[PDB]
CSV table of C-alpha atoms in Angstrom, one decimal:
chain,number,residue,atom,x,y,z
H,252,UNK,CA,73.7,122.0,108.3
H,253,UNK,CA,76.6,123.7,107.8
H,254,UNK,CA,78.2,121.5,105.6
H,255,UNK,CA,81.1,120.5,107.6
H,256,UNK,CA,79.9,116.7,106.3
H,257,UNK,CA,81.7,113.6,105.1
H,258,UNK,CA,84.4,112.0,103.1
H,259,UNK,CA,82.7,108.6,101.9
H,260,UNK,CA,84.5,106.8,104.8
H,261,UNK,CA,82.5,104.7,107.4
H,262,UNK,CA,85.0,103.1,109.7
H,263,UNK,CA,84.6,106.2,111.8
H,264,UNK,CA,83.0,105.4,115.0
H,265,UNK,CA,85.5,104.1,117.6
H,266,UNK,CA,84.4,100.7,117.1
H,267,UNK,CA,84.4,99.7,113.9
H,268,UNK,CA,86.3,96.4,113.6
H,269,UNK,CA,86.4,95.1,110.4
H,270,UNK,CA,86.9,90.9,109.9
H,271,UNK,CA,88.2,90.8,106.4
H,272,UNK,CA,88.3,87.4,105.2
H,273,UNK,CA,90.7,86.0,102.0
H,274,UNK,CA,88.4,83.5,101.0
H,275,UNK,CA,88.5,81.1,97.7
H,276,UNK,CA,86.8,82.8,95.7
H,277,UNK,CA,83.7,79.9,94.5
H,278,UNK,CA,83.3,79.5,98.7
H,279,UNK,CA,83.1,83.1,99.0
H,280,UNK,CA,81.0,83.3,96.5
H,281,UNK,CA,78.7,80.4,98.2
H,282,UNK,CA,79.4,81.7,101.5
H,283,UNK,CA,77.7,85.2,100.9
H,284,UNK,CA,75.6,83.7,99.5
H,285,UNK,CA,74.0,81.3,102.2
H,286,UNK,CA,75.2,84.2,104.9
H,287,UNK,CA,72.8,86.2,103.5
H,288,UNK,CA,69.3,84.7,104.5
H,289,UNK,CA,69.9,84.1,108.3
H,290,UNK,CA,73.3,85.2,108.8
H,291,UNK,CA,72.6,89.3,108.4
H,292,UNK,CA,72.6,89.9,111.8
H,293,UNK,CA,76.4,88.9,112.1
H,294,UNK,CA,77.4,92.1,110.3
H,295,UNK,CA,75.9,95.8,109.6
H,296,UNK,CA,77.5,96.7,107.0
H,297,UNK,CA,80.1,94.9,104.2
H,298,UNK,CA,81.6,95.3,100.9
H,299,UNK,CA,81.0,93.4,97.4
H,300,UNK,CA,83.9,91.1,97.2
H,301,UNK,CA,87.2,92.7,96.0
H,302,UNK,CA,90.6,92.0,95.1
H,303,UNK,CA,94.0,93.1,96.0
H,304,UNK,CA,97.1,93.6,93.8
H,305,UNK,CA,101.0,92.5,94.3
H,306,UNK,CA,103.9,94.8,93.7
H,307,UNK,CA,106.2,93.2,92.2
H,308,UNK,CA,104.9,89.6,90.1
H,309,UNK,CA,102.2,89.9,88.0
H,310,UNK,CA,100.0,88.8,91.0
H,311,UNK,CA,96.5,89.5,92.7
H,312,UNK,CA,94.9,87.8,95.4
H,313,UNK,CA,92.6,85.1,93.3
H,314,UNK,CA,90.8,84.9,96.8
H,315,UNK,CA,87.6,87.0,97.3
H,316,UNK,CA,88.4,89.7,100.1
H,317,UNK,CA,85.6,90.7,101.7
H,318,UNK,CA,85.3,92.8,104.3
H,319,UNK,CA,82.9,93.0,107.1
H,320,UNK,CA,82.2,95.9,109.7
H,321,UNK,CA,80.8,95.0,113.3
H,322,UNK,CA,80.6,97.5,116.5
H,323,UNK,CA,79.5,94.3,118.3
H,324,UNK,CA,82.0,92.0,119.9
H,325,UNK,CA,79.1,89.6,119.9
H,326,UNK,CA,78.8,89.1,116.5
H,327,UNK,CA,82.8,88.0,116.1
H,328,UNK,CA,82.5,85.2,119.3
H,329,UNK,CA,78.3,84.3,118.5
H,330,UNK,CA,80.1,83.6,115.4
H,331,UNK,CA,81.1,80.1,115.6
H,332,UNK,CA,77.6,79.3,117.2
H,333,UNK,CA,75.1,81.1,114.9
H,334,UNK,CA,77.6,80.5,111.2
H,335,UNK,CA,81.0,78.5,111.9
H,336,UNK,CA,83.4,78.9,109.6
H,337,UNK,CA,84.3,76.8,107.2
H,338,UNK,CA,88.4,75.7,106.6
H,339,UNK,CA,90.2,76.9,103.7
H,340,UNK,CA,89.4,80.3,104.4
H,341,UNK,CA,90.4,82.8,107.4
H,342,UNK,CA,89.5,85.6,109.0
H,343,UNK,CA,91.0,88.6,110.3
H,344,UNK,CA,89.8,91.1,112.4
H,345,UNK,CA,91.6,94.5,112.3
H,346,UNK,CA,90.4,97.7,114.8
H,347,UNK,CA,90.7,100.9,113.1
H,348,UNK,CA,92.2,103.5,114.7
H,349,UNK,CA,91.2,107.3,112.5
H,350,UNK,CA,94.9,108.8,112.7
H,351,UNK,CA,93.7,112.3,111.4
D,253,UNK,CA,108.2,75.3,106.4
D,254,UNK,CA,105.0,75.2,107.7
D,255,UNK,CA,103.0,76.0,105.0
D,256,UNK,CA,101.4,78.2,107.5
D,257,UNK,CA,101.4,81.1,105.6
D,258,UNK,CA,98.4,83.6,104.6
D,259,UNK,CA,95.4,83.6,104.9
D,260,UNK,CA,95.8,87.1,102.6
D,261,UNK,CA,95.5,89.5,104.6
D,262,UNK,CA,98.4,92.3,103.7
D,263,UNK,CA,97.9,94.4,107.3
D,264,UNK,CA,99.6,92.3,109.6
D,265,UNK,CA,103.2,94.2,110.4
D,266,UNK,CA,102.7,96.8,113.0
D,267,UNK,CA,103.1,100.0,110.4
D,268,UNK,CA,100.4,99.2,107.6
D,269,UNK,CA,98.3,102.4,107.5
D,270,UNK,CA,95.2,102.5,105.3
D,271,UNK,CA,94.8,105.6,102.9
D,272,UNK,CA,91.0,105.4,102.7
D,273,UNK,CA,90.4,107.7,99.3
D,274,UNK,CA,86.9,107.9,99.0
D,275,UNK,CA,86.8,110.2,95.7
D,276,UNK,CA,84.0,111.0,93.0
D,277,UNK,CA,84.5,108.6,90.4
D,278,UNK,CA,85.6,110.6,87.8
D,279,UNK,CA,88.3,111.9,89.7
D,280,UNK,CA,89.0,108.9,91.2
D,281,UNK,CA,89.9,107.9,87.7
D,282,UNK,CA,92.0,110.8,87.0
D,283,UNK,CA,93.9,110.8,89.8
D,284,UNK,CA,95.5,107.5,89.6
D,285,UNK,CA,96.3,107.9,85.7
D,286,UNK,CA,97.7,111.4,86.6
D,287,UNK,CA,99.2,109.9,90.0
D,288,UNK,CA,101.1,106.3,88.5
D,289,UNK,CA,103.6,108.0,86.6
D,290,UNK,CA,105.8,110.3,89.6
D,291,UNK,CA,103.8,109.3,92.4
D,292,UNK,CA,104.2,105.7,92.2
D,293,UNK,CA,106.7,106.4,95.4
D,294,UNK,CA,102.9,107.4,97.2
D,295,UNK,CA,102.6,103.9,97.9
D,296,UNK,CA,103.8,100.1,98.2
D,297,UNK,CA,100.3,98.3,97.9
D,298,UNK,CA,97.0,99.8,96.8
D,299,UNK,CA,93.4,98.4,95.8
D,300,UNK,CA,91.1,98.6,92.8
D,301,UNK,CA,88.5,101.4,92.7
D,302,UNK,CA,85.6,99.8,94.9
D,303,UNK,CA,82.5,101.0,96.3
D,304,UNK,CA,80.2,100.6,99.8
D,305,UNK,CA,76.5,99.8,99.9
D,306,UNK,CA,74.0,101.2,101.8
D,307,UNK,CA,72.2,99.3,104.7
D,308,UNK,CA,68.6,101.1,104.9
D,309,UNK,CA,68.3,103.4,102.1
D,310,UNK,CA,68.7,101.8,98.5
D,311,UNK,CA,72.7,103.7,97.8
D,312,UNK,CA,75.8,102.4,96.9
D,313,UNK,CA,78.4,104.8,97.2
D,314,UNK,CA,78.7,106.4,94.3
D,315,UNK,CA,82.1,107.7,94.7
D,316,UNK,CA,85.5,105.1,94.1
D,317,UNK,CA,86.6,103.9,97.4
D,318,UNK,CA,90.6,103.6,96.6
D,319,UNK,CA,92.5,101.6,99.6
D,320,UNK,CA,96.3,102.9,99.7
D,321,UNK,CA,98.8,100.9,102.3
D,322,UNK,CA,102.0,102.3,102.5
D,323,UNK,CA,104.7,102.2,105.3
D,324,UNK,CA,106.3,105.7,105.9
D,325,UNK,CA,104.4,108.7,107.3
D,326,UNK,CA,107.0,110.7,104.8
D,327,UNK,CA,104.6,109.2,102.5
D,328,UNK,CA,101.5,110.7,104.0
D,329,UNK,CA,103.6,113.9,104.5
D,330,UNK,CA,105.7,113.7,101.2
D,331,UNK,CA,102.4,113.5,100.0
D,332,UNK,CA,101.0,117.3,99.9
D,333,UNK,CA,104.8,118.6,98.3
D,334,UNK,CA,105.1,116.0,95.4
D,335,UNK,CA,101.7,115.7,94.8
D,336,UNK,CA,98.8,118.4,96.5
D,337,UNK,CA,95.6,116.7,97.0
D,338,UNK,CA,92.5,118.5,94.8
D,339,UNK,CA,89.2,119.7,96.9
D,340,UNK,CA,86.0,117.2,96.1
D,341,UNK,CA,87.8,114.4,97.5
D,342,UNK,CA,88.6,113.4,101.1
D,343,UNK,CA,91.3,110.9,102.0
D,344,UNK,CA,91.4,109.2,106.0
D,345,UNK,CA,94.3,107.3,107.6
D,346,UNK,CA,93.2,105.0,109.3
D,347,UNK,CA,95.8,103.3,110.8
D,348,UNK,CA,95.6,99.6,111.9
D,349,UNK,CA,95.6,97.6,114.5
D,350,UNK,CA,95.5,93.3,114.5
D,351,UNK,CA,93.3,91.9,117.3
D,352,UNK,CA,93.1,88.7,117.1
């Protein structure tokens, strides 16, 4: 094209929420897992599960961050009719705004 | 107390801007071993290296998907004095709002 193309970033498009969820990670784990099969149309696209680091103890987060990227709005509130979630975990669902 | 803590989510304070550094592995790899040491003052919180997959065509990304949350804009800003970013890579702030 010309290549005026991309940095590896997809949370481009003005409407890219992303629900990350700080799940245990075994019910994470299970969770994708039974997601998966009938449960795809609740998300386009997601990450592996990941991890984040502390500062200052010698801590992580042992819980299994996922992160899930919906344009629909439907997806977030069909939620709790097509896959409720389970306790234990929660969700959060952060808009992201491109600053640059 | 409660405990009604996290759920462990670490963008919840109105002034958590993502660094999204989606570098080619390699130089992923390099630039936090090169980075730690001086430029440790970059950031407050930061991930692992991870990696996106593709929905329709069979990809990953092959390049390391670094998340960076820091506070200040000086440290954006700071940023291109202290430490210059190399060509090859991209890096997007996406700065981050809580719905919910």
């Amino acid at each position: 094209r010309r290549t005026t193309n991309d940095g590896f970033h997809l949370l481009k498009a003005g409407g890219s929420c992303f629900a990350l969820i700080s799940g245990t990670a075994n019910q994470v784990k299970c969770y994708r897992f039974r997601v998966k099969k009938n449960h795809r149309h609740r998300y386009e696209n997601c990450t592996t599960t990941w991890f984040t680091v502390a500062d200052n103890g010698a801590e992580r987060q042992g819980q299994a961050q996922i992160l899930i990227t919906f344009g629909s709005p439907s997806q977030r509130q069909d939620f709790l009719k097509h896959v409720p979630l389970p306790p234990g975990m929660n969700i959060s669902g952060f808009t992201a705004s491109l600053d640059f």
